[PDB]
Every structure is written in C-alpha cells, then in structure tokens.
Amino acid sequence: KWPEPVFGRLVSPGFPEKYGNHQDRSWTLTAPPGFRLRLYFTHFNLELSYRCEYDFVKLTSGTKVLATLCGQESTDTERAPGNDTFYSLGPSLKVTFHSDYSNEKPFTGFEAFYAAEDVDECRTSLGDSVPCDHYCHNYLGGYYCSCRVGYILHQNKHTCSALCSGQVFTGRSGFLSSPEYPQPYPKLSSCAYNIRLEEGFSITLDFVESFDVEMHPEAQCPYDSLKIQTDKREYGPFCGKTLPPRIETDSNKVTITFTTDESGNHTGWKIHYTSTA
Amino acid sequence: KWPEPVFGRLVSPGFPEKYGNHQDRSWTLTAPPGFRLRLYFTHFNLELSYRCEYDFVKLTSGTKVLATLCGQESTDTERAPGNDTFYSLGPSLKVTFHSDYSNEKPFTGFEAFYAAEDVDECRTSLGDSVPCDHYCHNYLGGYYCSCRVGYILHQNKHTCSALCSGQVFTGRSGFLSSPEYPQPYPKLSSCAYNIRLEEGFSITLDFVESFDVEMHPEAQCPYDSLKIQTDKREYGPFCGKTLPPRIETDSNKVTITFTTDESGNHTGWKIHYTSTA
Ligand SMILES: *[C@@H]1O[C@H](CO)[C@@H](O)[C@H](O)[C@H]1NC(C)=O
Ligand SMILES: *[C@@H]1O[C@H](CO)[C@@H](O)[C@H](O)[C@H]1NC(C)=O
Ligand SMILES: [Ca+2]
Ligand SMILES: [Ca+2]
Ligand SMILES: [Ca+2]
Ligand SMILES: [Ca+2]
Ligand SMILES: [Ca+2]
Ligand SMILES: [Ca+2]
C-alpha cells in the first residue's frame, strides 16, 4: 500500500519565471503512518505585505497553521523561509499558494522540496512522558518496547510486568519483599509468594523496614492489594504508609499475593518471616 | 521486494539465563539499498579475556571488523558496548557469538536490538566531496539532486549544466562573458553566443578584464574550449591565463562557442564587442 518512498518538488505557477495574479493553488502531501513530512525551499521570492495578506505560501498541518510565508527576508510581522526546515504534524502537510491582483516587481515565486522521514517515538523529550516503560525501540514507520530482566511486556505492549510470582520458601526464616524494594515497585504486576513448612510449625510474619503501598482516603485499597492467605483465615488487604502489626498465624502454609495497578511510585513493603513449634 | 520495515532482536543462547560453552552462532542482518543498520545492546555480560579471545561478540560489516566485544566494562585492550550505538557499513551487518570451553562465573550473555535506518547521502562531511553539484535532496532509500536557476541537471544526474546558450546580440556594442564571471564557470556546459548585425558593419572583439580558461601544458585546450566562428574564418580554441589579442573580424555575424568539462575552478573570460563600418 506504501511500497514507494514519498518525496517530491513544489513550484509556484510559472517557475522559474514570474508568477501570475489571482492565482490559487494547493498541494496535499501525505506520508504513511509513522512518518512525517520535511519541507524546505530552494527558492523563495514573493511580494511583501502586512501579515502576507496579498501573496503568500501557507503551510498547514491539520488545524495548525505551521507557516505563512511572504517576501524575501523576514520581518516582525512577516516570515520568509530562508534555509529553514518545516516538519508536518502527523503524516500529512498542506501547502497553499495565493496571489492577489497585482505585482509591482516581477517576483519569481518559489521552489520547495519535500520528503517523508521516520518519526522517532523513542525521542528524549527532556520533560515529557515516554511511550514504553523500560526500553524503547524505534523503527521505520513505528516503534515497540521491551523490558529489563525479570519482566515481561504487559498486554498493553508498553508496561513491564514483573516476574514476581514463582517464589517458594521452605526455610525456617527469611525475607520477602515487593519487587525492586526499597525502590518503587513496578506496575500491573501480580506477585504470588508461597511459604510452605512441615506440619509441626507455625509461621510468624513481620512487616519490618518500611511500608508504603498506594492507598485511597475513602475506599481503602483499590489500587494495589497486599493480601495474606493462610490455612485458618485471610488477612488484608493492606495499604498505607505505616508498618502493619505482627501476624501470628497458626498454620504452616501461607500465600502472600500482591497486585499493582498502572501508576504510582510507592516504595513497597518488606516482610521477615519466622516460625516456631 | 522490501515492503516491510527491517528490525529485530538478538540474544545469546539461553538468554536471559547463563550461556553455554563451545557455542558458535551468527546473524546476518540485511537492509534494502539506501539503508544501513543500527544496533545497540540492552544487555551485555560476558567473560573478560585478552583481546576477547575466549568469549566474544563480533560486529563485522563487509571486510571491516566494526567491533569485538567482551566482558562487562571496557579496558585498554577489550571493549564492552555499554550504551554505544553501532552502524553498519552498507546495507548489511554480521554479528558473531563465540564462547570457549569454560566460564568461571555464570555470565548471562547479551541482548541486542537492531533496526534499518535511512542513509543521508546529502550529509555535510565538513571536508569531503558532496554527491550533487548544487542542491542535494535526501529521501528514504536514496537521494537525488537539483540545480540553481539558470541550470539544468546533466545526464549524469549530478552535474549542473548552465543554460548558457540562447543569447543573441543585435546591438552595436556590448559585453558577453562565461557563466557566473568573474566567479568560476560551471561544468559540462555548452554555451553558444550569437552576434548578428546589419550587412554594413564589421564586429571587433576585445578580451577585456581577465582570461583564465583551463589549459594543458602539452595538448593545448582539450578541457575547456573557447572558439570564435565568423563568416570569413574561425578563431581558437583559446586557453590560458592571459588576455588574447584583439580580433578584428571583417564580418557582421559571429558565433562564440564555449564548452567545459567536468572539473576545474577557473574564473573564465569576458569579451567586449564593438563594431564599425
Ligand atoms: C543555505 O543552504 C545552502 C546550501 O543548500 C548554503 O549554500 C547557504 O549558505 C545556506 N544559508 C545559510 C544562511 O546557512
Ligand atoms: C543507557 O541507556 C539507559 C536507557 O535505555 C539509561 O537508563 C542509562 O542511563 C544509559 N547510560 C548512560 C551511561 O547514559
Ligand atoms: Ca501580488
Ligand atoms: Ca518510528
Ligand atoms: Ca500502583
Ligand atoms: Ca567462556
Ligand atoms: Ca537516503
Ligand atoms: Ca573545466
């Protein structure tokens, strides 16, 4: 559908000769998705007038008026292109030439050259939001993203969900924490921790260093959910910014599930588990 | 033939797990003509050894060995990629992974991402030669060139030949010169000047300000030829760096042809023609 590259040349009527009066002309340049248009002038010589009302070349991209060019050299109220480069917003750019009823001097019009180039969606905005969560990979006509080690790309193909499940503890004591603790825990992750001991023991849980899981002031914990499910009962969900109290379970088996939503920079939780008999 | 964009992912055997011993592997990435390949690593952790003889990832583009990467962080004799970006020479790039018989530590190998990007043939080399004579226009997978006003693109589609022919002088006196005089005259141009007066007059030719047409020390004027053809005889070809003597023709018609080759920065000639009866 777009097998050939997009480029070309635009000229005022009669170029390189003098352009006429009462002329109205336009070119609509379109590129494939993922591309934008780059336009520049090899030649520009038009009638100068206030706000370029008489003769002009107008570059519009969508509803935006990218440029209104007149004259030979720019003023405080008029712009001439010179060696400037004009980039379309999106894969289309419209160029309109208009001339009024008269020319005092024999103005020779314009010559411009355009070409489609790739958009780099992985650009470093130095202040704005970036497409993908971890690694951004740009290619001609598109982009895609990937994640660091320990993650898999979410269904939305941008978020990096943590490989947080899979941990099984058979030891008498130990530590388990939210992913990347004490650094902010990842987004859209479903982490399941298992603790399985022999039939004689009971497991004790201690929230130890810092607790900070996203919380709403009215609804309690609709964003990120830390639940503790044993054999006797279940505990939670836990949310907030202070250490939850000690949990003396009467069981030898306990599963801790921790789910996260798509936003937040909360630093998470850490649990030291012990056991007695 | 190349309807889809070129991009992809490369990993060491077993990534993200430990890579094995006695492994030999390679990927040959190819882009369409006009494109080159851009490769970078999201992950790199290999065995360090002198000149990366034991384990390595080698980037070769043609006969050139672009890189030989080992270890975690670079040394005086070994290189590790880090965040560096590697560009192929031409539309192909080969990547070779090799591992020897043993690994002391559990090295986790590499992850790399590549994509085809356009070559900008119109680049500003800041010292080298530029593709086209006047204006260079880059597009995806290629380039083309154009000329200033007064020129047409030569058959070779790079050189700008001057629209130098077409001038006819009916006046009693006047000036004709090589194109762009006193600036160096263009290349591969065939310029014909005509001087046509009434039957009663004879035309006088004066080489006036400066003469500088390309000349060979043995063969006289095989590069650029300035010939003067009247009704009685012909004069020339003229070449060299000094003003030719006055030419009193006995005719009312004279054609001056001036042809140029594909190189040279010689400033040209200027002729003031007069006439009497
Ligand atoms: C504009 O570009 C041309 C080359 O295409 C160059 O000769 C000229 O110097 C440039 N003008 C400026 C102000 O850089
Ligand atoms: C390498 O790139 C990553 C982003 O992909 C960035 O986090 C890291 O700081 C970069 N390293 C350096 C030394 O710039
Ligand atoms: Ca006008
Ligand atoms: Ca892109
Ligand atoms: Ca959250
Ligand atoms: Ca090894
Ligand atoms: Ca190109
Ligand atoms: Ca020459």
Author numbering:
A (entry chain A), B (entry chain A): 2 to 278
Quoted from the paper:
Because there was no structure of rat MASP-1 3D, and the existing structure of rat MASP-2 3D lacked two of the three Ca2+, including those Ca2+ that form part of the binding site for MBL, both rat MASP-1 3D and MASP-2 3D were crystallized in the presence of 2 mM calcium and diffraction data were collected. For MASP-2 3D, 279 of 280 residues were visible. The only notable differences were in the N-terminal seven residues and in a loop within the EGF-like domain (Thr125–Ser130), probably reflecting flexibility. A major difference, however, was that the structures now contained three bound Ca2+ compared with the single Ca2+ in the EGF-like domain of the earlier MASP-2 3D structure. In the MASP-2 CUB1 domain, Ca2+ formed contacts with six oxygen atoms in the side chains of Glu48, Asp56, Asp101, and Asn104 and the main chain oxygen of Ser103 (distances between 2.3 and 2.7 Å). The firm identification in this study of the three Ca2+ sites in rat MASP-2 now resolves a key ambiguity of the earlier rat MASP-2 structure (Feinberg et al., 2003).
The lectin pathway of complement is activated by complexes comprising a recognition component (mannose-binding lectin, serum ficolins, collectin-LK or collectin-K1) and a serine protease (MASP-1 or MASP-2). MASPs are homodimers that circulate as zymogens bound to the collagenous domains of MBL. Each MASP comprises two N-terminal CUB (C1r/C1s, Uegf, and bone morphogenetic protein-1) domains separated by an epidermal growth factor (EGF)-like domain followed by two short complement regulator (SCR) domains and a C-terminal serine protease (SP) domain.
